A = this chain, B = another copy of it.
Amino acid sequence: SDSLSFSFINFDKDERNVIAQGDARIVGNNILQLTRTDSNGSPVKSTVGRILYVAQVRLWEKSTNRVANFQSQFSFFLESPLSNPADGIAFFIAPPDTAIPSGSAGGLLGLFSPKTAQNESANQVLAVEFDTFYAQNSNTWDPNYPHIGIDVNSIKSAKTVRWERREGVTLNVLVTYNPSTRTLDVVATYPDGQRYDISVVVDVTTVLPEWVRVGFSAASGEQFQTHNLESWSFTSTLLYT
C-alpha cells in the first residue's frame, strides 16, 4: 500500500469504510455526530465517540527508509448551551487496533488513559486537538484558554495556539505532514477568514508504528457539547527520504 486517499463530502448512514467506536453515529442529515446525544439531539455527559477509516495507512517503512506525507482536510462544528462546553474534537493517528481507552470520557478526549496520559513512552497517538475546556484545577496539562494543539504521545500538547470557539460555526482545517522537514502543520479557518496556525517538528517513525489507522475522536465529561464532523478528505503517499 504505497498510497491511499478518500473523501467524504458528507456521511452516509450505510457507509462501509468507517470503523465507528463508542457513541459515534451518522445522523439522518449526513453529519458524523461523535459524542452521544439524547433523543432531542441535546449533548450528554460522559461520552466518547471515534471513527477510523477502514483501510490501513503505511506511514513509514524501515526496510526502504520511506516515510509518508499526508494531508487531512476536514470541517466540524460544536454546539452547547453551556458557558464552559467540553471537551473537544481531535484528528488522530494510532495503531490499527486502537480502541477507546478506559477513563478517556472527558479531558483525555477519547485518546488517553489517566495513569499514562502524560507519559510519552506509554502511548502511540499523534493528534491535532480543538480543545474547548481548560479549567486549571482539572485539565492541568492545558494552557488557560481554548486552544488548538498538536499532541505527540501525550495529552499535554507539544505546541498550542490560542483559539476562539464559535457556537454552531463550522471550522475548516488542513493538517499536513512533510516528511522531508518532519513538520506537522495545522491551518484552521472560520467563514469570516479568521485563521489559526500551529506546527511542530515531529519524526513520525519514533511516535507511531509502520502501519496506522487515521480518524477522529471526541469526548465530553462533566461538561458537554456536540462534536459534529461535516466532511473529511485524506491522502497519504510513501516517499523516499
Say whether, besides A7-B3, A8-B2, A96 and B55 are in contact (CB < 8 Å).
no
Q: What bracket does the count of chain A residues touching chain B fall in? A: 20 to 34
- How distant is A81 from chain B, measured CB to nearest CB, in Å? 33
B5:A1 contact, CB within 8 angstroms: no
B6-A56 in contact (CB<8A): no
> Does A3 lie within 8 Å of B5, measured CB to CB?
yes
Residue of B nearest to A213 (CB): B16
Oligomer copy total: 2
| Cβ-based interface call for A161 (8 A) | no
From B9, B16, B54, B58, A211 is in contact (CB under 8 Å) with B16
Docked pose: A96 CA to B16 CA in angstroms? 10
A240 to chain B, nearest CB (A): 11
Nearest CB in chain B: distance from A174 CB, A: 17
Contact A6 B16 (CB under 8 A): no
A15 at interface by CB-CB < 8 Å? yes
Residues of B within 8 A of A56 (CB): 16-17
**Does A4 reach chain B (CB closer than 8 Å)?**
yes
* A23: Cβ under 8 A from any B Cβ: no
Closest-by-CB residue of B relative to A12 is B1
| Shortest Cβ gap from A98 to chain B (Å) | 14
Known: A54-B54, A55-B55. A17 touches B1 (CB 8 A): yes
Chain B residues whose CB sits within 8 angstroms of the CB of A54 once the complex forms: 54-55
A6, B8: Cβ atoms closer than 8 Å: no
Provide a sorted-by-A list of 24 A–B residue pairs whose CB atoms are within 8 angstroms.
A1-B6, A1-B7, A1-B8, A1-B15, A1-B17, A2-B7, A2-B9, A3-B5, A3-B6, A3-B233, A4-B17, A5-B5, A5-B6, A5-B235, A6-B55, A7-B237, A12-B58, A16-B55, A16-B56, A16-B211, A17-B56, A54-B54, A54-B55, A55-B55
